Amino acid sequence: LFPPQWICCDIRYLDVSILGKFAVVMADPPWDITLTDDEMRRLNIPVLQDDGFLFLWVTGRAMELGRECLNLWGYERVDEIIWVKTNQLQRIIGHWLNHGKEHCLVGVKGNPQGFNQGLDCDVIVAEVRSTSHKPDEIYGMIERLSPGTRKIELFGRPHNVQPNWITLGNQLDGIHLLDPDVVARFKQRYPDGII
Amino acid sequence: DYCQHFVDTGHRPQNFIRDELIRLKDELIAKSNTPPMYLQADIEAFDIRELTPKFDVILLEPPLEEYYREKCWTWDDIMKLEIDEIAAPRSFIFLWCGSGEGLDLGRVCLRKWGYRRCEDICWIKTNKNNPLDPKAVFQRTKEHCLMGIKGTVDIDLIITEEPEIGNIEKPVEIFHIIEHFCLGRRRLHLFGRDSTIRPGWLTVGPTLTNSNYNAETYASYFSAPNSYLTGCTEEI
Ligand SMILES: CNc1cc(N2CCC[C@@](O)(CNC(=O)c3ccc(CN4CCCCC4)cc3)C2)ncn1
């Protein structure tokens, strides 16, 4: 369980029912600003969690569409994190204003208990690594908020693999799984290994 | 890792952010600016239609109960303002939403009044000089001012030190941002204060102590040949 796990797949077609329940979901979707808005809406996000948190990266019109999916999926937006983008000197690196930041909506669902609310603050200041990479500070914040719990990232890239996380994304290296219960249902649901 | 540091030391990550000519634009704005006008008015009991002409810009800063942590307006109250009744067919809005449910309900308002959101401007509050809502997962250190367009330079970040308790004032930088957009000269500030009155703006609010607004006098500043000035050019 604890070490990094991942699955090369198309999140549209994966039966995510086989993965079980998670304390935290994160998603960095390819908004059409690609999955059409209907595909985004019909993602089977609701089966992934019963109680816990969703982190959902938004930009442009996805700031409104993502709120829609968030409520659609059964969540209540309770926070919004912004990542202020800097360089190595900590200086700051949408046809109206230049864009200094990325937004990530925080959704709650059910009534999660035993989480460390208030440990971090809703602003991240961190250097832009490769383009489209997200700052690793978000994993630190997520861990302090729900230590040692199951987590899943949707539309993650190979560098996103992290202990306690299963990472789903189409540019990953195959299927790498270790939690026995997941291993089971995957062989049951996918006995021949295609999807 | 500035998030680990804040956990360790109480210094919010923003504390460690560092930091042509223009300037001509600022004097073009300042020369174009109409005299300041201001009107005390209880906006709840006020037919907003008495404010003519239609405005090129509206800056809306209702007093949310969240601003008093240590009369407040609910988003129930705000949503029922007939802002579309005083907005020019092509016009902009800048709505201060705070950091709670206003980020959602403020977007409802914009849509209800006919705008679409084109920018999300964040006021990031440093606490260099002094290192929670029940629903809050995180410590809240910023405020959002949403920009809306209806009809057909600068960053989206305001960084200042957090103001002392009970000080509800928003950074004066929002005005520079707005005025550098050069959206016209009919500028309305709802829930403004004596402290916010500004050349080039009409300020309406319940706590104003004085008023000088006259509809015909106000309308006189935009009669021909001045009807379509961006506010960023020479006197016609
Ligand atoms: C077709 N159906 C799929 C698709 C799919 N992907 C599509 C190809 C790319 C992918 O491989 C990895 N995602 C990204 O590279 C990606 C990175 C960053 C952003 C924006 N971002 C900037 C960083 C901070 C937040 C905002 C958006 C996307 C996932 N995966 C599974 N099924």
Side-chain angles (χ1 to χ4, degrees), chain B residues 83-89 91-115 117-124:
Chain B
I83 298 295
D84 60 296
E85 289 309 317
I86 72 194
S91 45
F92 300 78
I93 189 162
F94 291 87
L95 168 82
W96 282 110
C97 298
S99 55
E101 71 183 355
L103 313 192
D104 308 296
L105 299 163
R107 290 171 149 82
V108 184
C109 293
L110 262 56
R111 282 184 304 255
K112 186 209 216 142
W113 307 326
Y115 307 87
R117 184 204 48 84
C118 260
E119 290 296 338
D120 181 328
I121 302 168
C122 286
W123 176 22
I124 303 177

Side-chain angles (χ1 to χ4, degrees), chain B residues 173-215 217-227:
Chain B
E173 282 94 322
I174 189 70
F175 287 103
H176 310 166
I177 277 162
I178 286 157
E179 288 152 5
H180 292 152
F181 286 156
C182 314
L183 313 171
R185 309 170 60 237
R186 283 161 220 90
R187 313 189 184 104
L188 172 76
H189 184 196
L190 281 156
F191 300 105
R193 299 177 302 284
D194 276 7
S195 57
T196 66
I197 282 160
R198 191 160 168 103
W201 286 86
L202 162 62
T203 299
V204 178
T207 70
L208 298 210
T209 73
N210 281 74
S211 320
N212 70 344
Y213 177 65
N214 177 288
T217 314
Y218 187 69
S220 104
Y221 304 133
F222 315 102
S223 58
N226 309 316
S227 298

